[PDB]
Amino acid sequence: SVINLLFAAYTGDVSALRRFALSAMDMEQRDYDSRTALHVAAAEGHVEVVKFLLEACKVNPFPKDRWNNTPMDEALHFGHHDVFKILQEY
């Protein structure tokens, strides 16, 4: 569910993301702005969420939102340098 997934990313709720992924939720679904859970996590600087999505869920690391920004662009824009460097590995 878009509401549940992207809000869980927004609040850093790794436990909820895990329940969703285990239940086979598509962790790459997008909202009306073409945003992903990874975009939102990276914009908030949620390191553990970003690592979970990338490593355990294998999500696309470079989705493009409606402004053509990637999660890495968002991390740099909002000052989350640790998240930025995590995404750099990809």
Q: Does 45 bind Na ion (CB under 5 A)?
A: yes
Contact in structure between 38 and 73 (CB atoms under 8 Å): no
Cα→Cα distances 33→16, 46, 48, Å: 22, 20, 24
From the list 19-27, 30-38, 51-59, 82-90, the region that binds a second copy by CB under 8 A is: 30-38
- Residues contacting a second copy: total by CB under 8 A: 16
Part of the chain binding a second copy (CB under 8 A), chosen from 15-23, 25-33, 53-61, 81-89: 25-33
Helix (H) or strand (E) holding 50: helix 47-51
Give the binding site for Na ion (CB under 5 A): 45
